[PDB]
Design a protein around this nucleic acid. Structure first.
Ligand SMILES: [Mn+2]
Length: 738
RNA sequence: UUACCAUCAACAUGGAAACUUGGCUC
RNA sequence: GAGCCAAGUUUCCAUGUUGAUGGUA
């Protein structure tokens, strides 16, 4: 196993006797802080300890059903009436009590002089300020109380908040200091697209438009029905005095249709959130940023321990915790994971087991691949700017062709007179028109060019179906960084040409491993990519996408079963399904609706009635793991499984760290088995997941997700932004999308 | 677009609970 | 009074994607 530390962060044991009230303010105050001040002033009637969210409140004592209080606003001496209802009891301290738990612990963070930014709390006393880009990088913790199989935990990981130490108003002031002619247009271009955050209610808004005619001295109407000015609004509610009465106003017109009336924002107390573009190019600034932000497991655990010491040091936060019956542990939680054995990577004439690094970038380019096709009559499309460089590749391509036992002829020498996209398209079309037996088509470009990749995959997956390869000069012009890159280039070449690269021994007989990916960037239509194994060694993968109603994946399953029929000759046995991640709260929509809708598609086939295991694969995980080495906390070894205590209560799931981590702490991947009709054991199912983590052929090593999952992700990525079309059926038997 | 991995920044979606609004039904 | 549906607000979150900067081959 692995004696890791941390896992889900320390146990936070709680208490009972909560009561849920809905405080109505007449007139309604729109400020959380001043409403909290009124309900702390009224502690004679509402009791010593209150948990207030802004509109919904929690007390440890049962009041009466209707409570009317006469409070005074601390700004204009406005006599307002507080209307305390009595809604819920919340006796058993179930999942219903979790938002109240997060409310009291968020105030526990708040009165430690930690600012609330986004969903997290950050410490300004730990300031790391860069005056070169006038910003502060000040750290904090992303705290949230959750419930898992081990019980009630508080998850907090080290989040660093990039606060530009200059308001949005100060940003336009600085721009006006720089440019005083076209200040408005460039300020609008900078602000639109990246958000601002209002710090009086920590709320983030996208700058849809900026109104320079609108002024805070002008008056607007609330949703309640009162005509008030912005100086008056902020002064009576939030207590903010507007310094400069000539600001613009930021409008955040929301998405779809009151809801979509408008939202108006003041630049004075809204701040920028993003990394400056001047900071990105600066090598020393980014060196400081990624030396102080990618914390080691030692530094991450030390920051969490410093948070624990700060909480135990301040008497007010601890007093709040015990007066609400909460308690934080002395240190973080300690359980043990499990290290899976390394899997033997198989080639033609030999196979090798792997060491702790789980990388085979040098163990591959000594032995021949299991099936490489006789690569002949291929072409190389290059421009003259990479001329000599490109010639070198061809030479070392032969110097790699021998080691991996793959026969390569001198290709076509095709020139690209210009780097235009349609020039590439027409020269590949001319090459395919002249000779119809061209196997592979490879182009070379300058810089990250997404539209060239789009049209190359357009032509080589839709119009004229041929395997293709795209090469960039950002890396290929490096002398010492060339051999290990050309190795992976030739491996991808053999992969997309239909030749089977390295395999892993799959211990399950006659299975159809399926991965799907629902790609929806907004714009473009949502597309489900679908990759299904059609062999016993799982080396060739059938592919198909659909365009969406998401339950109707149409003929994907029956086409996969038809090609498995045509290849394996009337012996289908098993189906293993790997779906993309969905919010918890979309697991039932996946579980009890979509799967016993696609399981009825098997009736189209002649009385099959198969087995089926459906996963939900969740990748972005804010839970961190550190190995508790006898000196300190180090990076966990690849192949680590946490199948308990940090997983969901309702379902069967596990977290797998299946990759080499050199920077910071790794992200384990969450796999939730929503269907297990084939009666897979957890050990066999996660070993199959790790086996497919080995199976990804575009990286000579293991990855965090299974190979069909990343195959479907690349395929749906293609059909979303790179194709906008179903791929041609000729290439669907190959891994053309790598 | 040779890849993989970290960490920041950001959007969209969904769940749950209160309140409000509008509809049907005892 | 009372059950259900739809939408919005406020709290809590959850997941996916995007861009960026690094590390390594
Ligand atoms: Mn995906």
């Amino acid at each position: 196993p692995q004696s890791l530390g941390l896992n889900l962060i320390k146990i936070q044991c709680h208490n009972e006797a909560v009561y849920q009230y809905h405080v109505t303010f007449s007139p309604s105050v729109e400020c959380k802080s001043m409403r909290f001040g009124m309900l702390k002033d009224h502690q004679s009637v509402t009791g010593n300890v209150t948990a207030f969210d802004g509109s919904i409140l929690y007390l440890p004592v049962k009041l009466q059903q209707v409570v009317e209080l006469k409070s005074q606003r601390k700004t204009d001496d406005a006599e307002i009436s507080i209307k305390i209802q009595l809604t819920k009891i919340l006796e058993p301290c179930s999942d219903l009590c979790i938002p109240f738990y997060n409310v009291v612990f968020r105030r526990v963070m708040k009165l430690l002089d930690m600012k609330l930014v986004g969903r997290n709390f950050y410490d300004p006393t730990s300031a790391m300020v860069l005056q070169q880009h006038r910003l502060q990088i000040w750290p904090g913790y992303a705290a949230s109380i959750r419930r898992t199989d081990g019980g009630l935990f508080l998850l907090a990981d080290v989040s660093h908040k990039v606060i530009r130490n200059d308001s949005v108003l100060d940003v336009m002031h600085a721009i006006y200091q720089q440019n005083k002619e076209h200040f408005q247009d460039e300020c609008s271009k900078l602000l639109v697209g990246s958000i601002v955050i209002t710090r009086y209610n920590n709320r983030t808004y996208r700058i849809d438009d900026v109104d320079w005619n609108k002024t805070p001295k002008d008056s607007f109407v609330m949703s309640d029905g009162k005509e008030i000015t912005f100086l008056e609004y902020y002064s009576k509610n939030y207590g903010i005095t507007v310094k400069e009465d000539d600001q613009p106003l930021l409008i955040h017109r929301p998405s779809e249709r009151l809801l979509k009336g408008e939202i108006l924002l003041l630049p004075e107390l809204s701040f920028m959130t993003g990394i400056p573009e001047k900071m990105k190019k600066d090598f020393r600034a980014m060196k400081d940023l990624t030396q102080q932000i990618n914390l080691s497991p030692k530094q991450h655990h030390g920051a969490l321990e410093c948070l624990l010491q700060r909480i135990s040091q301040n008497e007010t936060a601890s007093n709040e915790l015990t007066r609400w019956g909460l308690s934080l542990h002395k240190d973080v939680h300690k359980i043990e994971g499990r290290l899976l054995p390394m899997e033997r990577i198989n080639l033609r004439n030999t196979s090798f087991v792997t060491s702790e690094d789980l990388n085979w970038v040098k163990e591959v380019t000594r032995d021949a691949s299991i099936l490489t096709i006789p690569m002949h009559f291929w072409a190389l499309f290059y421009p003259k700017r990479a001329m000599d460089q490109a010639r070198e590749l061809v030479n070392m391509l032969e110097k790699i062709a021998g080691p991996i036992g793959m026969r390569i002829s001198p290709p076509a020498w095709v020139e690209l007179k210009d780097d235009r996209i349609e020039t590439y398209i027409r020269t590949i079309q001319s090459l395919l028109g002249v000779e119809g037996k061209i196997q592979m088509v490879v182009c070379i470009i300058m810089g990250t060019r997404d539209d060239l990749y789009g049209a190359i995959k357009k032509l080589c997956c839709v119009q004229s179906p041929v395997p293709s390869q795209v090469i960039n000069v950002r890396t290929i012009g490096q002398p010492t960084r060339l051999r290990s890159v050309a190795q992976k280039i030739l491996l991808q070449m053999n992969c997309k040409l239909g030749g089977e690269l390295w395999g892993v021994d799959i211990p399950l007989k006659q299975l159809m491993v399926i991965g799907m990916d629902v790609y929806h960037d907004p714009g473009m239509r949502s597309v489900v990519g679908f990759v299904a194994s059609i062999n016993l060694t799982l080396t060739k993968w059938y592919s198909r996408v659909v365009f969406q109603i998401v339950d109707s994946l149409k003929l994907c399953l029956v086409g996969s079963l038809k090609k498995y029929y045509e290849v394996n000759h009337c012996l289908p046995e098993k189906i293993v399904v790997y779906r993309d991640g969905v919010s918890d709260g979309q697991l039932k929509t996946v579980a009890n609706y979509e799967i016993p809708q696609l399981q009825k598609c098997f009736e189209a086939f002649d009385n099959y009635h198969p087995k089926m295991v459906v996963f939900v694969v969740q990748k972005k995980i804010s839970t961190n793991l550190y190995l508790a080495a006898p000196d300190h906390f180090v990076t966990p070894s690849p192949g680590t499984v946490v199948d308990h205590t940090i997983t969901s209560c309702e379902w069967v799931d596990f977290y797998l760290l299946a990759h080499h981590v050199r920077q910071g702490c790794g992200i384990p991947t969450h796999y939730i088995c929503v269907l297990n009709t084939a009666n897979l054991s957890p050990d066999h199912m996660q070993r199959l997941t790790f086996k497919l983590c080995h199976m990804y052929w575009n990286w000579p090593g293991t990855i965090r997700v299974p190979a069909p999952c990343k195959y479907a992700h690349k395929l749906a990525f293609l059909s979303g932004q790179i194709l906008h079309h179903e791929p041609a059926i000729q290439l669907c038997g190959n891994l053309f999308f790598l």
